[PDB]
Amino acid sequence: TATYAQALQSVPETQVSQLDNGLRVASEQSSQPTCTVGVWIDAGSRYESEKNNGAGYFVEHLAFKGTKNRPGNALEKEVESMGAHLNAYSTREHTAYYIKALSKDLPKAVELLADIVQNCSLEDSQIEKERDVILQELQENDTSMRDVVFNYLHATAFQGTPLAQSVEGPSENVRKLSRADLTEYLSRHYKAPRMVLAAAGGLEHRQLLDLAQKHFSGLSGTYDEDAVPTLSPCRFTGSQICHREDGLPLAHVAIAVEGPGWAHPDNVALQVANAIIGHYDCTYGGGAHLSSPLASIAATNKLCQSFQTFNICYADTGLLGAHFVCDHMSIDDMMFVLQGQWMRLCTSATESEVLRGKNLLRNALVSHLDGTTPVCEDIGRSLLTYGRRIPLAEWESRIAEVDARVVREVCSKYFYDQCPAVAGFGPIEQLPDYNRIRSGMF
Amino acid sequence: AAVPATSESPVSVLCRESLRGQAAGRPLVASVSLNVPASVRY
Amino acid sequence: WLEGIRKWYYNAAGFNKLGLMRDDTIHENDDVKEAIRRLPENLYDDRVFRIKRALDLSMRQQILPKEQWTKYEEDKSYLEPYLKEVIRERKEREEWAKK
Amino acid sequence: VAPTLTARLYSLLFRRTSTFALTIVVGALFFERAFDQGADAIYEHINEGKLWKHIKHKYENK
Amino acid sequence: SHTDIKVPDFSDYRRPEVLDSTKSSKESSEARKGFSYLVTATTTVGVAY
Amino acid sequence: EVPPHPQDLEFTRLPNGLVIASLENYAPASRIGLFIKAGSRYENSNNLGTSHLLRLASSLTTKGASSFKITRGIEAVGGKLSVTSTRENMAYTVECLRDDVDILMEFLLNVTTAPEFRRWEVAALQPQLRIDKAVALQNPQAHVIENLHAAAYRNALANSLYCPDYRIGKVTPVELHDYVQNHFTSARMALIGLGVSHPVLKQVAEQFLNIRGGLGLSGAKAKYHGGEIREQNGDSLVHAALVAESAAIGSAEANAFSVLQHVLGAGPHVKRGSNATSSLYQAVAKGVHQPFDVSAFNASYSDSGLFGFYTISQAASAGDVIKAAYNQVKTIAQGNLSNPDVQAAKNKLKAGYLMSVESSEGFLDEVGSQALAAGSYTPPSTVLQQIDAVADADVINAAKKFVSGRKSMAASGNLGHTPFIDEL
Amino acid sequence: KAVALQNPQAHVIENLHAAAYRNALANSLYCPDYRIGKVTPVELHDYVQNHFTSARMALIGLGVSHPVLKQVAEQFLNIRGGLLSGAKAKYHGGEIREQNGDSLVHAALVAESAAIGSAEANAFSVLQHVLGAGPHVKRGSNATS
Numbered sequence A: 001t002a003t004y005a006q007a008l009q010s011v012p013e014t015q016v017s018q019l020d021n022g023l024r025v026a027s028e029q030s031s032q033p034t035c036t037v038g039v040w041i042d043a044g045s046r047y048e049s050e051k052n053n054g055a056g057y058f059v060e061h062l063a064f065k066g067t068k069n070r071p072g073n074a075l076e077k078e079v080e081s082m083g084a085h086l087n088a089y090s091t092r093e094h095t096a097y098y099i100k101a102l103s104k105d106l107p108k109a110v111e112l113l114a115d116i117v118q119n120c121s122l123e124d125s126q127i128e129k130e131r132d133v134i135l136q137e138l139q140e141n142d143t144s145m146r147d148v149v150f151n152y153l154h155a156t157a158f159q160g161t162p163l164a165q166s167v168e169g170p171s172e173n174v175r176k177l178s179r180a181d182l183t184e185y186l187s188r189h190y191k192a193p194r195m196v197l198a199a200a201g202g203l204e205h206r207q208l209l210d211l212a213q214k215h216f217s218g219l220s221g222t223y224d225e226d227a228v229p230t231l232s233p234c235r236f237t238g239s240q241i242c243h244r245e246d247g248l249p250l251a252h253v254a255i256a257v258e259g260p261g262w263a264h265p266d267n268v269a270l271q272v273a274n275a276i277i278g279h280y281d282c283t284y285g286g287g288a289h290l291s292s293p294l295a296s297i298a299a300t301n302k303l304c305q306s307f308q309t310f311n312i313c314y315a316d317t318g319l320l321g322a323h324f325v326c327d328h329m330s331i332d333d334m335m336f337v338l339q340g341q342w343m344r345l346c347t348s349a350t351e352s353e354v355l356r357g358k359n360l361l362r363n364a365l366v367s368h369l370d371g372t373t374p375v376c377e378d379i380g381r382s383l384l385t386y387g388r389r390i391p392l393a394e395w396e397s398r399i400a401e402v403d404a405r406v407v408r409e410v411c412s413k414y415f416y417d418q419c420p421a422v423a424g425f426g427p428i429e430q431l432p433d434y435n436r437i438r439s440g441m442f
Numbered sequence B: 001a002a003v004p005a006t007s008e009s010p011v012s013v014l015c016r017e018s019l020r021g022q023a024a025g026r027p028l029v030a031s032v033s034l035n036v037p038a039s040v041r042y
Numbered sequence C: 001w002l003e004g005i006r007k008w009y010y011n012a013a014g015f016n017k018l019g020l021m022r023d024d025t026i027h028e029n030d031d032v033k034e035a036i037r038r039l040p041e042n043l044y045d046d047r048v049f050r051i052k053r054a055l056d057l058s059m060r061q062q063i064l065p066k067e068q069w070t071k072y073e074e075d076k077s078y079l080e081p082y083l084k085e086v087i088r089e090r091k092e093r094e095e096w097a098k099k
Numbered sequence D: 001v002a003p004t005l006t007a008r009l010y011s012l013l014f015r016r017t018s019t020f021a022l023t024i025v026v027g028a029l030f031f032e033r034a035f036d037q038g039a040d041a042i043y044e045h046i047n048e049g050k051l052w053k054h055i056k057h058k059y060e061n062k
Numbered sequence E: 001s002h003t004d005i006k007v008p009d010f011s012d013y014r015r016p017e018v019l020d021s022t023k024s025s026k027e028s029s030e031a032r033k034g035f036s037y038l039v040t041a042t043t044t045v046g047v048a049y
Numbered sequence F: 001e002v003p004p005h006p007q008d009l010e011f012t013r014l015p016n017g018l019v020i021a022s023l024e025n026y027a028p029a030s031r032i033g034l035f036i037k038a039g040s041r042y043e044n045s046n047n048l049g050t051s052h053l054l055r056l057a058s059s060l061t062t063k064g065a066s067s068f069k070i071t072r073g074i075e076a077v078g079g080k081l082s083v084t085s086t087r088e089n090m091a092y093t094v095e096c097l098r099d100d101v102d103i104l105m106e107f108l109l110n111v112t113t114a115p116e117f118r119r120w121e122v123a124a125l126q127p128q129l130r131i132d133k134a135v136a137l138q139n140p141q142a143h144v145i146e147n148l149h150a151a152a153y154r155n156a157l158a159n160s161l162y163c164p165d166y167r168i169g170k171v172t173p174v175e176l177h178d179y180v181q182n183h184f185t186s187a188r189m190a191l192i193g194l195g196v197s198h199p200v201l202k203q204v205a206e207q208f209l210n211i212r213g214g215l216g217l218s219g220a221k222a223k224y225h226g227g228e229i230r231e232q233n234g235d236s237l238v239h240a241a242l243v244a245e246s247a248a249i250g251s252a253e254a255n256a257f258s259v260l261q262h263v264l265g266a267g268p269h270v271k272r273g274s275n276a277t278s279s280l281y282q283a284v285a286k287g288v289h290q291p292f293d294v295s296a297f298n299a300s301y302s303d304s305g306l307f308g309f310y311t312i313s314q315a316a317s318a319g320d321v322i323k324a325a326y327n328q329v330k331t332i333a334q335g336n337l338s339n340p341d342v343q344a345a346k347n348k349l350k351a352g353y354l355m356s357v358e359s360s361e362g363f364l365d366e367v368g369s370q371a372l373a374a375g376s377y378t379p380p381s382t383v384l385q386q387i388d389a390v391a392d393a394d395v396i397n398a399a400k401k402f403v404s405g406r407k408s409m410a411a412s413g414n415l416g417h418t419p420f421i422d423e424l
Numbered sequence G: 001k002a003v004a005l006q007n008p009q010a011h012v013i014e015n016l017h018a019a020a021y022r023n024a025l026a027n028s029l030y031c032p033d034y035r036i037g038k039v040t041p042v043e044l045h046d047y048v049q050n051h052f053t054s055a056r057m058a059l060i061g062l063g064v065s066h067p068v069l070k071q072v073a074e075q076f077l078n079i080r081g082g083l084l085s086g087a088k089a090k091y092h093g094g095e096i097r098e099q100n101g102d103s104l105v106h107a108a109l110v111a112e113s114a115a116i117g118s119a120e121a122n123a124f125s126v127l128q129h130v131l132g133a134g135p136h137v138k139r140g141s142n143a144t145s
């Protein structure tokens, strides 16, 4: 009564319009009485210099603290009283501010976002308050070994480049960044041509466009001649960073090879490969019967508490690899099996496992785009990265093209005899020497 | 399944901002999975 | 009568003279070791004692009084259901491995 | 649009282990012949006229 | 903060072809690996001889 | 573009009592859940923790599929099988691309209707109870909320979602078979589907889902008692919850409490915001300059409910935060309640309810929960109307019921300055 | 602690005091599990300095002369700067139920009575023996209990 292939075609196309100032407006209409609307910006620590690294994160902390039109908690009270939710997030390349609200409140939602993105107060006393909150959050992040090891992995794999920088910035910058630094950062990156107004839910594109024309037209579409921030390529460096701390109970290790970058077609076959190796943690019910050899071995031999493969993408590079948490006596075994599995895929992926990978990736894609928020973000981010919304029907075609041969060739291209970036934190005396890890890549 | 849980299990707060949302407002739910990390809500 | 020859063979084999049951004499490969592990406590403890008693008799180069020899008609397979399942499970895994 | 010598050697002969192995093999055969002949030539030149092979003609025809 | 941790400069040790941080190192990885594997290969032929 | 329809929810109550409900959203993936009244409230003091092990036993061997085939077969199609429990229900849910629903459905049926609970598999699984509990208990809220219920009730709802430690390694196969046979019965179940046609879901239920004794062996009425459990553990932060018995889910008084919860504050609306419109947060802040958090707590069940608030503060400030939060509730109970407040609460509640069902998971859970609690489906339209119908006097009376009701309390952390119920 | 806790009475009597008092007397004789490995040297020094003081001590001897116990106390036990003091135990009332499945249930039910040394304390001591305070005959039927 409807094949999986037909459900793909039934997905409403994403509508894309553009304002005179360069701002893109995109939406996916559904029948939901709620929606998510927000602004995605091509701004992130990758655009920051050693000097103002942390600026973007600082702004995120002030973004909802009051605007010129709605000073102090006024903005907050408006969002709350209509039962909406206002959230934000900053990564190394993108920033986003978005609202979840009743579809009927779309007008007030679009207004509030416009207000936030253009009339943010950045009061001096609030900047001093946030300075302390951020310093506290830095201390909290220090207790998250996962956060720490991923920041280290970036710091070493992209050493000497803007991608080596963390999103939050060094504590000394949090202490010295000034309103001037922030206003400078904002005026330079928050430009209409670098923003996408996205929305998903029970709303029509024309209405969103209407609201966009009304509230974002004044948004600047220019910034000097030497203002236009441009990303330079970020060199990847095979290397290792080890923060030995025997006082911690478990070791965290993250290892990655340089990935292709967002726009590259290879990402699909790489996601299929990562889906084959998969993820795992001590609470999974499959145990010894898990399809992934790594998960299976890990479970029966109790080699780790958890592990996850990942494909972190940036403009023209990325981190393709895995992260695992284990006992100090299991690091070597984990690394051995993990690398063994990468080599197995490069040289012998079988059709049956690649078919399992494809199916997992199909299920991941669809189950992920469930709800207005995930869809809205996919719209915002896709426009910024691909420059278009890639339809599920297209994703299916790209996945369908992947077979054992493609997995072997694509995995060989990125893993086989390539230098990895390695980050370790905790009781890591048993983390293999870099030469051994490197030899394990072939 | 294919999607990994937001937080992987293994066996924070230093400011109010990071504390907001921690207070429980609803009854507990416990989930176990074959392919995904366990979770506890509320 | 195949059964005539069977009872004759059972007694000629002679593990019954050591008070053993046929399953007590099976060569323990990995399937068998798993089946034994799955045995309920009483059957497991019984197997252990019959083997201990047999090894002890063997050591003394003695056998049990004839009235205590395991009888052909009474020897039943206590291991079969567990071992059959262990073998079916392994065969299943191998099929999936071949895919 | 052009790879250097080593980058070319890597892709064709060094990346695969089977090819890397076959490169060393044929490498060894071609190397042995040329090394031995070259080395011998140097030796015989350093010792021109002193070796049996050099004065042998004066006594042969046997 | 762990974010105060920055990898030290290694420019003094880097091969010339990976000195530019605004250029991808993949463009030279084949050459860089080929060299090393030539040495290895030649050492192997010399030892086999 | 124009949405895919939007079709309506199809309902069907079979003769045996089993409810089937499906909504075709024409989505590429399906989601099927079998909801059962088998939550931990149905355990008695002799088999505590049985439903927890049961929740962990979904991949054990069944009469129609070995443990190995369940895991490999579901992973082969990239699917998912999970088990969720609350104190009243258990929900077994599978996810997969729509072409593979027949496969997931057979595994789901085997797991829920044909478990074998083999002695050796059940024994080897017991350690998992310890791992699963330790992970859950790393959350102080889990400790507090479990203790809260144990303090509030004499039985039933007092049971933990997690196996008591003394029971780990002692849950028997006969106990599991017993539990499944007594509660996994047709009149205590609902098969809910999303992205699958109602006809097939119905044919599946008719052909593979019958099991008389329909109503099954439910349990005694939850008896509210009141009391307090204090867990000293020296954490720099004290987590505490204070509640009174409120109202059974489905009753009108329940809505008044939902609105009261949103008048007081039921969670953040703005990232790092100051919760300007949260009555409890603002009251506490106006008296505590220490870091803290507070939230209204609302737990509604089939035959009872718990309402109050939950606080998180530094150990030294526990008593100030708790007392300030409590005094704010007393004032509402005193009649001091703006209509503009109630209106804001209703907006939060109505918007929150709609957002909670916009994803397949939330929707399935909502339909699944209604199917079991009221054996019927109230659409959002009606729920919203029901929220609007709540009067300010109702909210004030809910508050008064809380204030004058015998309290239940649970706290954990360094309790040197955490008050006892009688000091409030 | 594990050795002491093998006795159900120990569990019950410790929980009884924790249920009866808000503080002071509510404290267990056994270290809470979360504190094991965390008791510091400074905590020990301070505990000894605050409570091991002359006014909080009694030196009792059997088969030793009073003169020497006295000389010992005068010369080595003249210590001040304590805390004689301590929060007044505040009776509260409550109940702690520990489910553990033992075939036997151990339970204690009490109410606040009287401070030792008071006349009311003697009434309770007598009441205790009216009710029954332990066996007098091996395997007897406690006829007078």
Ligand SMILES: CCCCCCO[C@@H]1O[C@H](CO)[C@@H](O)[C@H](O)[C@H]1O
Binding pocket: C004, C005, C008
């Ligand atoms: C090595 C020769 C094997 C012959 C088969 C044994 O056959 C057995 O022999 C017994 C004693 O004669 C009989 O009592 C018994 O009925 C008969 O089946």
Ligand SMILES: CCCCCCO[C@@H]1O[C@H](CO)[C@@H](O)[C@H](O)[C@H]1O
Binding pocket: C030, C031, C033, C034, C089, C090, C092, C093, F061, F066, F067, F068, F120, F121
């Ligand atoms: C020495 C060899 C040990 C073999 C252990 C087999 O173990 C069995 O494997 C089955 C998979 O088909 C499982 O379904 C079953 O629960 C498990 O006990």
